């Protein structure tokens, strides 16, 4: 059976598409406002050199900080999100921030050369740029694999925004108070996604797509964990806080 999208479900999708269009600039016109990217010579991938310089950290920190602000804006427009207590809203935002950023970044990722291309060459990020920010291949390699796997699903924008919403409204995040409420909200989003796929997504892969999408969420949890481990080590580097931002410090601290 392929039940049609209810009037409410269609409304949820419209609201999410609008939220994304208002919080994701496909032209990346704000990027020149971030601290400039600095790419030092490190063809050997020296951890000692990378940690002593962290030349790309200021730029990527601003990029991520900026993105967290956009994510907060997006999340506030998710139907039902504002019904939660502020305590639960903040817990959900802090816990999923990095995951949603990895998800939304897929829009600028390109399989042409396995990079995130944001306009001009200065704003093209490769594996080597992330290592210059203090992160290791233990995170980067699985991240690139994740980006490629996601690109291959060829998600409709409707599916993409629903996935980010579902990721944020997760009842199994540490410290959530009203898990039942959060679960009701996520279920409404999950059923909307499942219905949209069986109804609007053409074959091949009509079905199976939902399961592959849910598995990506599991993949994100793992990446989240590894990122946290690496952030901790990074915070041990003297004078590192100045290269970040208050928002990044709170969310990842």
Ligand X SMILES: C=C1/C(=C\C=C2/CCC[C@]3(C)[C@@H]([C@H](C)/C=C/[C@@H](O)C4CC4)CC[C@@H]23)C[C@@H](O)C[C@@H]1O
| Both structure tokens of 90 | 């903040």
Q: Could you tell me which residues come within 8 angstroms of residue 21 by beta carbon, excluding any fewer than 6 positions away?
A: none
In angstroms, the CA 78 to CA 85 distance is 14
Note whether 249 and 68 are within 8 A (CB). no
Residue range at the interface with ligand X (CB under 6 A); choices 55-63, 162-170, 171-179, 181-189:
55-63
Nearer CB in complex with ligand X: 84/164: 164
11 is in an annotated binding site: no
Contact set for ligand X, span 91-150 (CB under 6 A) = 101-102, 104-105, 107-108, 116, 118, 125, 130, 133, 135, 139
What character string, x for contact with ligand X (CB under 6 A) and - otherwise, covers 171-210?
----------------------------------------
Nearer CB in complex with ligand X: 81/125: 125
For residue 238, CA distances in Å to 45, 53, 80, 233 come to: 20, 11, 42, 11
Residue range at the interface with ligand X (CB under 6 A); choices 2-10, 44-52, 56-64, 86-94:
56-64
DSSP helix/strand/coil, 115? strand
Size of the site for ligand X (CB under 6 A): 22
In angstroms, the CA 234 to CA 136 distance is 11
Query: Where on the chain is the footprint of ligand X (CB under 6 A)?
Result: 57, 60-61, 63-64, 67, 101-102, 104-105, 107-108, 116, 118, 125, 130, 133, 135, 139, 227, 231, 248
């Amino acid at each position: 059976l392929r039940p049609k999208l209810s009037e409410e479900q269609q409304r949820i999708i419209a609201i999410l598409l609008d939220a994304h269009h208002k919080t994701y600039d496909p032209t990346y016109s704000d990027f020149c406002q971030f601290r400039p990217p600095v790419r030092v010579n490190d063809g050997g991938g020296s951890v000692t050199l990378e940690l002593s310089q962290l030349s790309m950290l200021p730029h990527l920190a601003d990029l991520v900080s900026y993105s967290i602000q956009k994510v907060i804006g997006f999340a506030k427009m998710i139907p039902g999100f504002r019904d939660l207590t502020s305590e639960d809203q903040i817990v959900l935002l802090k816990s999923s921030a990095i995951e949603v950023i990895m998800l939304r970044s897929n829009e600028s990722f390109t399989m042409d050369d396995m990079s995130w291309t944001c306009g001009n060459q200065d704003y093209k990020y490769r594996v080597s740029d992330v290592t210059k920010a203090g992160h290791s291949l233990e995170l980067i390699e699985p991240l690139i694999k994740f980006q490629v796997g996601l690109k291959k699903l060829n998600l409709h924008e409707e599916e993409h925004v629903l996935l980010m919403a579902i990721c944020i409204v997760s009842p199994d995040r540490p410290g959530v108070q009203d898990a039942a409420l959060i679960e009701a909200i996520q279920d409404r989003l999950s059923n909307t996604l499942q219905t949209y796929i069986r109804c609007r997504h053409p074959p091949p892969g009509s079905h199976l797509l939902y399961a592959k999408m849910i598995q990506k969420l599991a993949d994100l949890r793992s990446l989240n964990e590894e990122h946290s481990k690496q952030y901790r080590c990074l915070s041990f580097q003297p004078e590192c806080s100045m290269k970040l931002t208050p928002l990044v410090l709170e969310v990842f601290g």
